[PDB]
């Protein structure tokens, strides 16, 4: 950066850095389900008397 404050000024900055990280997690689950169902046979589909 440059600028004006009681005359001309300038600054040049550098930077470097190194971070590390580690973590856990635990996740449960639970559920239920239902179902129905049919079928049919077209041809030979009923019996009579």
């Amino acid at each position: 950066n440059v600028g004006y404050q009681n005359g001309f000024t300038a600054n040049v900055t550098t930077n470097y850095s190194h971070t590390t990280d580690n973590s856990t997690a635990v996740q449960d689950s639970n559920g239920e389900s239902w179902n129905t169902g049919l079928s049919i046979n077209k041809g030979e589909s009923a019996y009579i008397n």
Binding site: T13, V26, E32
Partner: protein
């Protein structure tokens, strides 16, 4: 002189066909629930000039 003799024969009136398929329908529902708990931890260094 003439002979005693029977003469027969058959004749078609109608004809009906009937197929064979096995159709099926199904219907279902579902319900579920889950929880999660976790924890992280991190560190950082750095130098600028």
């Amino acid at each position: 002189l003439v002979a005693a003799y029977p003469i027969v024969g058959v004749g078609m009136e109608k004809l009906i066909i009937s197929t064979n398929e096995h159709a099926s329908t199904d219907q279902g529902k579902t319900v579920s629930r889950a929880t999660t708990n976790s924890k992280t931890e991190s560190n950082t260094a750095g130098v600028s000039v």
